[PDB]
Design a protein around this ligand. Structure first.
Ligand SMILES: CCCCCCCC/C=C\CCCCCCCC(=O)OC[C@H](O)CO
Length: 448
């Protein structure tokens, strides 16, 4: 009772700003698409195919790698190794640059890749140009996302929130400018995203460089620069997979929906369900980041007990958040489809799909908090191999079978999600109960 209250206050102190941070982070591509309008059926499929490509190969890796910074910097703030936080962060930037180069090399070929996959050459040309103008966003994120974990792993969530909201409003302005006054064309939104993310880079760099809050953590020691890069890849390769295997699968999901009977019907309804799923996953990502932060810090501080109650408090947040969003959807299960489409067949499809998505809500929340525990403790490789096991070896076969042979074209798809997500939580539950907190604190000591 006395221990839960203590960490519940500090986990929530990180949970709310990072939740709003995540809201402002996913509401940025939505702003790109909305400002552009429907310039054309060709440009619609070209930009969608471009941003889907870019997210599958390059962006998921970049966003997933600094799970290494969540464990390394997160445990380093607990042991008060304040020089190593800056060393880990700037070694992450240095590591991200050659990876950005590789991804850009691959992006130069996107047109020839898509035409070889059997797509329209003109759609592949639009996608090639749009993806080519998203290259500055790669190196910009190589600066921003390590800085993101730099502020998060210490508890400086408010500078992250202020700079994120500022970046969102900036992106609204220059998307308006680029699309409406500069009339660039289809790639206007892409270049506006490059400008916005570099603005995010200079404001985060400005705060970290000129603020008293980051006086103890800013700066890197030259000697350890070779060691930290090694350690970052140690915990970067699994974490990146733990993100890629999810985004890739969701991409596979939408393509599978395009091969069913009535493809527009099932694809529109499935896009509704997964937009809803991610819209809850942003708050679920906020609670996950908070749990990862506090557990990593308590493991670094040599206190496994407070790390346990850290997990408990995050599960409490999961309970109230997931019950809230689940019951809230179920109240408007028969109307919420009207917000997405005007066809009556679609609204009833998502209406029948609503309880299964409620299960997806509570499952995604549970697996996100426990995956945050995995990132904060340092066993991300468990999460990666469980991702392949839960979604590719179980969920995808049961999802494909139920959807195609059982005349459950759209619902069967989502059933493969739920069962897969369920298996995911089950193993994530076992490994978080059997795990020794005594050793994780001692193991965190030698990591840092
Ligand atoms: C039933 C189907 C299951 C499918 C497979 C799902 C993944 C779980 C597999 C093994 C976890 C075993 C528990 C391992 C706990 C130790 C984690 C750890 O920290 O290992 C670090 C290691 O010493 C390096 O330095």
């Amino acid at each position: 009772s006395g221990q839960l209250t203590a960490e519940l206050k500090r986990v929530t102190r990180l949970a709310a700003p990072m939740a709003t941070v995540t809201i402002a982070q996913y509401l940025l591509p939505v702003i790109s698409v909305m400002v552009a309008g429907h310039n054309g059926e060709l440009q619609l499929s070209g930009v969608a195919l471009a941003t889907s490509f870019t997210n599958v190969t390059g962006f998921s890796i970049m966003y997933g790698l600094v799970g290494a910074l969540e464990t390394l910097c997160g445990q380093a703030y607990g042991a008060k190794q304040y020089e190593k936080i800056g060393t880990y962060t700037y070694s992450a930037i240095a590591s991200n640059i050659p990876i950005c180069f590789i991804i850009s090399i691959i992006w130069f070929y996107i047109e020839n890749i898509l035409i070889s996959l059997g797509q329209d050459p003109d759609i592949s040309r639009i996608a090639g140009s749009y993806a080519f103008w998203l290259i500055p966003v790669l190196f910009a994120q190589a600066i921003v996302i390590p800085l993101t974990r730099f502020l998060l792993t210490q508890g400086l969530v408010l500078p992250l929130l202020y700079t994120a909201v500022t970046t969102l409003l900036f992106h609204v302005f220059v998307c308006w400018v680029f699309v409406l006054v500069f009339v660039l064309g289809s790639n206007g939104p892409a270049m506006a995203t490059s400008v916005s993310f570099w603005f995010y880079a200079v404001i985060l760099s400005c705060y970290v460089r000129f603020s008293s809050s980051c006086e103890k953590t800013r700066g890197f020691v030259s000697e350890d620069f070779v060691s930290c890069v090694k350690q970052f890849f140690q915990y970067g390769v699994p974490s990146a997979a733990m993100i890629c295997l999810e985004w890739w699968l969701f991409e596979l999901l939408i393509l599978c929906s395009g091969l069913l009977s009535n493809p527009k019907l099932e694809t529109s309804v499935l896009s509704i369900c997964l937009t809803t799923e991610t819209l809850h996953y942003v708050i679920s990502s906020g609670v996950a980041a908070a749990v990862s932060t506090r557990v990593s810090n308590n493991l670094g501080a040599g206190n496994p007990q407070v790390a346990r109650v850290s997990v408990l408090a995050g599960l409490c947040l999961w309970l109230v958040e997931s019950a809230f969003f689940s019951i809230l959807l179920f109240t408007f299960r028969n109307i919420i489809g009207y917000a997405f489409s005007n066809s009556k067949e679609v609204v009833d499809y998502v209406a029948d799909l609503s309880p299964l998505l409620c299960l997806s809500f509570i499952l995604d929340g549970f697996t996100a908090v426990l995956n945050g525990v995995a990132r904060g403790s340092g066993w991300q490789h468990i999460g990666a191999w469980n991702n392949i096991f839960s979604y590719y070896l179980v969920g995808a076969p049961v999802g494909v079978y139920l959807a195609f042979r059982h005349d459950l074209n759209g619902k069967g798809l989502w059933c493969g999600v739920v069962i897969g997500s369920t298996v995911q939580a089950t193993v994530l539950a076992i490994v978080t109960a059997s795990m020794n907190w005594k050793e994780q604190a001692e193991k965190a000591r030698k990591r840092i």
